[PDB]
A paper describes a structure:
We present the structural and functional characterisation of a subtilase autotransporter, Ssp, from the opportunistic pathogen [name]. Autotransporters (ATs) are the largest family of secreted proteins in Gram-negative bacteria with many having important roles in bacterial infection and disease, including adhering to and invading host cells, biofilm formation along with being potent cytotoxins and immunomodulators. Subtilase ATs comprise one of the two AT families which possess protease activity, with the other being the (chymo)trypsin-like protease ATs which include SPATEs (serine protease autotransporters of Enterobactericeae). We further reveal that the activity of the subtilase AT is required for entry into epithelial cells as well as causing cellular toxicity.
A number of SeMet datasets were merged, which were used along with the Ssp model to solve the structure using single isomorphous replacement with anomalous scattering (SIRAS) and molecular replacement with single wavelength anomalous diffraction (MRSAD). One molecule of Ssp is present in the asymmetric unit, where the resulting structure was refined against a higher resolution native (2.0 Å) dataset with a final and Rfactor/Rfree of 16.3/20.1 (crystallographic statistics in Table 1). The subtilase domain of Ssp is positioned directly on top of the β-helical domain, essentially capping the β-helical scaffold. The core architecture of the protease domain of Ssp is typical of the subtilisin-like folds observed in other subtilase enzymes. It is comprised of a globular α/β fold centrally featuring a twisted seven-stranded parallel β-sheet adjacent to two central α-helices and encompassing the active site residues D76, H112 and S341. A disulfide bond (Cys288 to Cys295) connects the last β-strand of the β-sheet to its preceding loop. In comparison to the subtilisin BPN’, the catalytic triad sits at the bottom of a deep cleft formed by two protruding β-hairpins (E1 and E3) on one side and an extended loop (E2) on the other which are absent from subtilisin BPN’. Ssp harbours a deletion, equivalent to residues 98–109 of subtilisin BPN’, adjacent to the subtilisin BPN’ S4 subsite. This results in a truncated α-helix and makes the binding cleft wider, which conceivably allows for a more extensive substrate binding interface. Interestingly, the Ssp β-helix is the shortest seen to date for an AT, comprising of seven right-handed triangular turns (~40 Å in length), with the last three β-strand rungs resembling an autochaperone domain, which previous studies have shown are involved in AT passenger folding. The structural characterisation of Ssp revealed the presence of three calcium binding sites, two in the subtilase domain and one in the β-helical stalk domain.
Numbering used by the authors: 29 to 642
Write the structure that this text describes.
Amino acid sequence: YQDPGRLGAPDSWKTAEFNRQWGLEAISAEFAYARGYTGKGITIGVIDNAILSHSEFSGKLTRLDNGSYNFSYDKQDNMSFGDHGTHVAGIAAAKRDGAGMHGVAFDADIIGTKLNDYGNRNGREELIQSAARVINNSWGIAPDIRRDAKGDIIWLPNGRPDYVAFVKSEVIAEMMRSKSSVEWGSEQPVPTGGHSAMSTLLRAARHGKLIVFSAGNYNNYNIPEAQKSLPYAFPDVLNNYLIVTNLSDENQLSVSSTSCGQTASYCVSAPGSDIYSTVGRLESNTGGAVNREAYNKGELSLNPGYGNKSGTSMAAPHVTGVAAVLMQRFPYMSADQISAVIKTTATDLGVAGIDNLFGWGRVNLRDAINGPKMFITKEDIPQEYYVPGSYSEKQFVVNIPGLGNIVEPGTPVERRCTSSECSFDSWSNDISGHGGLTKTGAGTLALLGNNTYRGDTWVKQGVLAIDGSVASNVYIENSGTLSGEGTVGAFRAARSGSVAPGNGIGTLHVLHDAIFDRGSQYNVEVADNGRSDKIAARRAFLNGGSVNVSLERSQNLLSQNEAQSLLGNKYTILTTTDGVTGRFENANPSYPFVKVALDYRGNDVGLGITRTDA
Ligand SMILES: [Ca+2]
Ligand SMILES: [Ca+2]
Ligand SMILES: [Ca+2]
């Protein structure tokens, strides 16, 4: 297969294979592909029916099971293959090989475990200890169906069973009653046979995995069950849970879909109606019965193919695929941070903001790959949907570790950061919300959006380059650097914190105060004819700090020859409208016959390359 997909060309990816699965276009998967993001090097876990050995998974599927496929029998032993797992796995990670359809994360690998009939190898603790980054759970418990006085199923005019509605207060009460036992269960390794589903998924979430669940197919008046309300008991894992509703098209829930309801603050919507994916079918070779007697006499074949299916079970793996693609885009992010990107970049549907039908809205890879749109705290969640104890962290802690460095050390998802996004990344999306940002790691993060997040910005390590704007106060600590040609609210550079305006020679704009503490660094680039770095601030407090002068993009302070070639040049390196208070400690470099000199003109600070009082 010669793939016509090309970097920079989203329409090049819209091939016949691509177009056979309408959900891909609906989540804008082609925009991720065009930027090189396919889920390559990412492992997805599936808990469902045993996935069929299918061409679409050849070389990329590991099963951890008791070595049999899942089969359902009726009263007369008519045998059928459970092709649910195969269908789910295909939506997330079928090969892009020019045949049939392909997954959202078409370069991702798959580890599959059996939901049911697992014997004494359920593979759960193995899955938890694997490098599987995200686990798809396209399963759950059905509520009662409403029955007539005879005991027959009452059907709604829409063709669906009249399911009884779960009640918010009752599902949350059931979860709260399970809390102490589920907490205990989650701390031990998962037994290989009988086991607690709730303890298993809590343990996986606490081992750094993203847990993705189908909302259920129990009608729009319905809400998710107690299992899917586990974050109410364990709000520490809310950011590692995503509940997924079923969209019949880009804007509308399937008539069968369960609503987000009480899970709305950790819920998104994805395509789930008439999804074309991988299946298997148990078939008679002799045009005879498909039953156990025939299976045993070798009369049957289990054949791979494709088929349509509908349900939140088909929506969930779109989000699992989206998560794997984003873990290649943002290899330094933890699962809770990948979750934040998926939630805050979803296209808002229905009632404005987070709502009981669509939650955060339709997952959108085109927006997701440009970074998060919100640093979420409790104050960003409508009270109706707020899970008590959730979103209590003020800071989004972004670790850009630098190429060759380990992230999530001591966890099953521990990995080396080996892509270019690990030394330099940029987020172009506008970031709002009440949270703040903490930049750590030796690498560089550039922010290009018009950011309104209310929290403080802490640069603890490496470079934060502001090219758009932040309304936030910035604190630059030891080994950190504030850079860029954009705007910040205010900054305070501490001992061994640096400010380096521009991308090379440029101006950093500060809406309020620029503060330099003792031992802070101001790295000024200069060129010919009074062109230099500058801070344009409302007001400045210089409690000390060193001004360090170099030529543009030079790794060293001015040499003696460079300084002498600039002798007599004057520069403006700091302007205020309301005044400069105090002075820098010193200005480097300084030589016997040429030095950098600082000139304090009341509202501005000048810099000269001057003689040494001679
Ligand atoms: Ca394919
Ligand atoms: Ca909405
Ligand atoms: Ca500069």
